Ligand SMILES: O=C(O)c1c[nH]c2ccccc12
């Protein structure tokens with residue numbers, strides 16, 4: 001028994017790094033940076049979301065997200081717009097061009113996830129996803 | 142249903158970022174950088190491990206780890222040594238000074254982990270830790 005062997009933050013960080021690194025290699029081989037992939041995948045099939053929400057789901061600092069959106073909007077892959085009510089809030093959406101650019105990569109991402117989860121079986125896979133979702137929802141600001 | 146809502150790499154990354162960020166604030170309030178905390182906590186109670194293993198468990202790139210160890214060894218918190226056999230391998234250990242420096246923070250880390258896991262109950266907490274450990278062991282290089 002070493003402290004790190006069963007310390008939750010260390011376990012989450014290692015599992016996340018290893019799984020994400022595998023798929024990020026595929027994304028780069030398909031011409032996407034990790035940050036572009038995270039943004040487009042987070043916006044695909046979504047209503048417009050705030051910059052702060054996008055930063056949270058992409059685990060990226062908000063100033064970095066803003067600069068990324070500057071370049072992604074220049075390339076027509078995303079669009080920023082004002083919020084219906086509070087204009088201290090900028091919303092962002094994926095465009096059709098961005099969705100078409102990322103659709104095949106998303107199918108590859110689903111295949112990779114299926115391979116990662118297959119050894120665990122449907123019950124354990126769903127339990128993992130449910131626990132992770134509940135943890136996120138309890139700890140998000 | 143949006144793709145990102147139940148995409149495993151996104152769930153792992155968000156849960157990890159949120160949980161780790163909470164404890165990293167405590168570490169900094171106790172005078173530790175995140176990288177110093179990760180290294181000392183990973184070495185506490187451990188036999189000497191390779192630099193590559195340390196980089197994996199601390200989710201830090203190996204060149205960055207080497208520079209970090211240069212400064213941590215200068216401060217007497219860790220020690221590098223040669224491997225018994227293959228001297229292409231450098232091992233690293235925590236020193237008594239480093240252990241005494243980090244012991245209280247480790248107790249705080251255990252308390253924080255207990256609070257994070259308490260709402261899930263012992264069964265779900267252990268299932269999460271077991272799944273994460275099995276995933277790491279399947280995906281580590
Ligand atoms: O806090 C984190 O994110 C950690 C990731 N790897 C680790 C190893 C030891 C302690 C904390 C962490």
Ligand SMILES: O=C(O)c1c[nH]c2ccccc12
Nearest residue numbers: 020038041057058150151154
């Ligand atoms: O691949 C990752 O690490 C991701 C973290 N947040 C995301 C959101 C959408 C897609 C991938 C990720």
